[PDB]
């Protein structure tokens, strides 16, 4: 019904899709609020420092724990679910969309570089809820695209915030004919119990070339 | 060096973004009459609108040639996946079209599927509002490669923190320990997360 999301990122331009898709009705009716934080308001140095190099050697820097750490106890209470963008986390599907729909305070930690010292999600799980996840099988630069990904897939099943088991068939508009090709005449029938089985024959079709792993 | 062209109605959510560069194009510029939609209901009946092939023919056809790799986001496509990734890395010209609603007339892939490379790819098992989003992860995958097992945990300074002490193996020093220690931490957490991987069932 009602929710607030806080993203913490050091690159919060990342996030103005965001403000770019969110309906004013939305926010003037309180159903939905999003902040973007930056990062570097937490740092505790004159350089801004959020990276370090890594125990036990490897490419790559790593967040410091400290930073971190201070800007989640100040944006988390209890009740907060800490959702934590990862290359190595558990799968985001729309089972987990549909779940956290229903939450009323989500923050997201966005990293970069190599992520986040281990102990700062580690320390949260001692006094809330945590979920490293990942939004599929490939690398990005850091988690401000899955966090786009992750706020869409979930605010649009949140009623009247965006405006809004098989693979789906394939769709046809106007005009009926278009480049020497047809709407396939059975969408023209008027016989809906006919039509409903050849979406259902493409559906399966298309599974079967596209996702045989759903089957 | 690559080229990307987006083609989409919501050209300001794509807002943020020298070998490369990402031209963000607004589909309605190409539009036969301004009062009309770029949207119609679907023949067969059925919830949603969907995109006319006719103002999307118009648009590719100018911004595409027939070596162009031609890309639809699309929740019935393809897994789009690292290999993916690394296939179109090598590409000199992707153009990605963004659909919005109940998505584009299956007409325009088949028909582009005539004259250049087409593919309907999927970013994941989750539904998104149009493919703008899948455009953003796609391109940002792609472009950071142009010239087995989940990683395990990693720690930086202070080695101990609010109690919290940094595995002692990782203050070793020794190569071959820390070898192990990390293989073992990525064996564990892939069990744990994702056991397809080595596989096991879901
Ligand atoms: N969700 C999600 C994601 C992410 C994601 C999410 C969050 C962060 C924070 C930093 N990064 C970058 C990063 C990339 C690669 C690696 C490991 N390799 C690097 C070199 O050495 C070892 C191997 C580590 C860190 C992130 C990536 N990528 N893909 C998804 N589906
Ligand atoms: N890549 C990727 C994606 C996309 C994606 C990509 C492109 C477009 C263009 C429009 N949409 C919206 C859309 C949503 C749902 C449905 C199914 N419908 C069936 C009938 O009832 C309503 C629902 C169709 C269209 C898009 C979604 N979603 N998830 C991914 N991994």
Request: hydrophobic fraction near 40%; aromatic fraction near 6%; include cysteine.
């Given at each position: 019904?009602?929710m ?8 919060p ?22 902040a973007?934080?930056?990062?570097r308001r ?7 420092s959020?990276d ?14 400290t ?25 985001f ?14 923050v997201?930690?966005?990293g970069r ?9 580690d ?14 099988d490939?690398?990005?630069?850091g988690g ?13 099943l ?19 004919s278009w480049r ?10 008027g ?7 050849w979406?259902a024959?493409?559906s ?12």
């Amino acid at each position: 019904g009602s929710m607030k999301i806080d993203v913490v990122t050091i690159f919060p331009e990342y996030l103005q899709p965001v403000r770019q898709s969110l309906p004013g009705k939305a926010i003037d009716a309180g159903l939905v609020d999003v902040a973007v934080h930056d990062l570097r308001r937490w740092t505790h140095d004159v350089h801004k420092s959020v990276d370090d190099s890594p125990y036990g050697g490897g490419p790559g820097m790593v967040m410091k724990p400290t930073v971190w750490g201070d800007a989640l106890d100040e944006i988390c209470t209890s009740e907060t679910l800490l959702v934590v963008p990862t290359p190595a986390g558990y799968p985001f599907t729309q089972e987990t969309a549909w779940q956290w729909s229903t939450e009323d305070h989500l923050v997201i930690a966005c990293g970069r570089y190599e992520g986040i010292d281990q102990r700062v999600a580690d320390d949260a799980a001692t006094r809330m809820r945590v979920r490293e996840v990942s939004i599929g099988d490939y690398v990005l630069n850091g988690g401000e695209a899955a966090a786009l990904v992750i706020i869409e897939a979930v605010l649009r099943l949140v009623p009247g915030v965006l405006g809004n088991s098989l693979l789906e068939g394939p769709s046809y508009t106007r005009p009926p004919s278009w480049r020497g090709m047809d709407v396939p005449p059975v969408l023209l029938s008027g016989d809906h119990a006919k039509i409903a089985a050849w979406r259902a024959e493409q559906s399966r079709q298309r599974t079967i070339e596209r996702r045989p792993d759903l089957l």
